[PDB]
Ligand binder design. Structure first.
Ligand SMILES: *[C@@H]1O[C@H](CO)[C@@H](O[C@@H]2O[C@H](CO)[C@@H](O)[C@H](O)[C@H]2NC(C)=O)[C@H](O)[C@H]1NC(C)=O
Ligand SMILES: [Ca+2]
Ligand SMILES: [Ca+2]
Ligand SMILES: [Cl-]
Lengths: 6, 274
C-alpha cells in the first residue's frame, strides 16, 4: 500500500 | 519559469490497462481500446509556487490544515508502519511544523487532497484529468510499454524518473539524484512533453475507483458513476520494484478524496487553453 487514506 | 504551461495531447485511440498485469488486485487488466479527444495537459505537476499563487488569490485552507494532520513517510522525519499521521504536516510544512517549503519552491505541492486539487484546477480554469486521459498522456504516444519512455527502467543507463533506489524503506541511496521530491521540471519529458508523469509525486485523477473493467471500447470514459475512493496514478519518489511497483502507466491505486500525504500531488488538464 503506497499512500494511506485519511 | 513557466510551470503552469500546458501541452496539447493529440486525439487518438490507445490501449488502456494491460493483459499482462503486474499487480492483478488493482484491475490493471483487461487491456481495452479507448478513444480520447484532443485536449491539454499540464506539462508539470503543480508546484509549491503555483499552489501558493492559488492560496494567495483565494485564501484557500487545505483539508490537511483543517484536519490538523496529514500522513508523512517516516524515512524523512496508517496503512504501514512507515506512515505516520503527523500533527501540523501540510503543503507548507511537508514533514511537520518544523519543516518548510522555502528551499523547494519548484517541487510538487504535497498534502493536497482530491478536493484541494479540484479547487486548484478549477481556480486555474482547468480540471483534473480522467484516468484514461492521464494514462494516455503518460504513455506518450507509445503502445503497450511499461513506462512513458519504453520497457527499460534506465534506458541508455540514464535515470528517467524519480523513484526509490536501495532497500525500501530502510535505505534510499538517492542514486537518481533525489531522495525526496525533485523539481517539477526534472528528468526528461515523455513523447508528449510531460515531466514526472511517473514518479516524484503520485497524481490524483477525477475517476471514482473500481477494479472491474469491461473489455468494451469506450470514448472519453469517466470511470464509474459512484464509489468511495478516487483514482491516483503514476507512483512516487518512494516507489520501488520490490514493494510499490506503480511507476508504470498502467498501474493504479486509490484513496478517499479527503486523503493527503507526503507523496501525493496532482496536475491539471483542460478541454481548451485557459
Ligand atoms: C504570496 O503572497 C505573499 C504575501 O504577499 C508574497 O510574499 C511577499 O511578496 C511581496 C511582494 O513581492 C514581497 O515584497 C514580500 O517580502 C513577501 N512577503 C513574504 C511574506 O514573504 C508571495 O510572493 C506570494 N507568492 C506567490 C507564489 O505569488
Ligand atoms: Ca529518487
Ligand atoms: Ca508524478
Ligand atoms: Cl509510492
Amino acid at each position: 500500500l503506497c499512500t494511506p487514506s485519511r | 519559469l513557466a510551470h503552469s504551461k500546458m501541452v496539447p495531447i493529440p486525439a487518438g485511440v490507445f490501449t488502456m490497462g494491460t493483459d499482462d498485469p503486474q499487480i492483478k488486485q488493482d484491475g490493471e487488466a483487461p487491456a481495452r481500446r479507448v478513444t480520447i479527444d484532443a485536449f491539454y495537459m499540464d506539462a508539470y505537476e503543480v508546484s509549491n509556487t503555483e499552489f501558493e499563487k492559488f492560496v494567495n488569490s483565494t485564501g484557500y485552507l487545505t483539508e490537511a490544515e483543517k484536519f490538523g494532520d496529514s500522513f508523512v513517510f517516516e524515512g524523512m522525519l496508517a496503512a504501514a508502519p512507515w506512515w505516520l499521521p503527523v500533527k501540523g504536516a501540510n503543503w507548507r510544512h511537508p514533514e511537520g511544523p518544523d519543516s518548510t517549503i522555502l528551499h523547494r519552491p519548484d517541487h510538487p505541492v504535497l498534502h493536497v487532497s482530491w478536493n484541494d486539487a479540484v479547487a486548484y484546477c478549477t481556480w486555474a480554469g482547468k480540471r483534473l484529468p480522467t484516468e484514461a486521459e492521464w494514462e494516455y498522456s503518460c504513455r506518450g504516444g507509445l503502445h503497450n510499454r511499461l513506462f512513458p519512455w519504453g520497457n527499460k527502467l534506465q534506458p541508455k543507463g540514464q535515470h528517467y524518473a524519480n523513484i526509490w533506489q536501495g532497500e525500501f524503506p530502510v535505505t534510499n541511496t538517492g542514486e537518481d539524484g533525489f531522495q525526496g521530491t525533485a523539481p517539477v521540471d526534472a528528468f526528461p519529458p515523455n513523447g508528449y512533453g510531460l515531466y514526472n508523469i511517473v514518479g516524484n509525486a503520485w497524481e490524483w485523477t477525477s475517476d471514482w475507483w473500481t477494479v472491474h473493467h469491461s473489455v468494451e471500447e469506450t470514448l472519453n470514459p469517466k470511470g464509474p458513476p459512484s464509489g468511495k475512493d478516487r483514482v491516483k496514478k503514476g507512483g512516487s519518489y518512494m516507489s520501488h520494484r520490490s514493494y510499490c511497483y506503480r511507476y508504470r502507466c498502467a498501474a493504479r491505486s486509490q484513496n478517499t478524496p479527503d486523503s493527503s500525504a507526503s507523496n501525493l500531488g496532482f496536475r491539471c488538464a483542460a478541454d481548451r487553453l485557459p
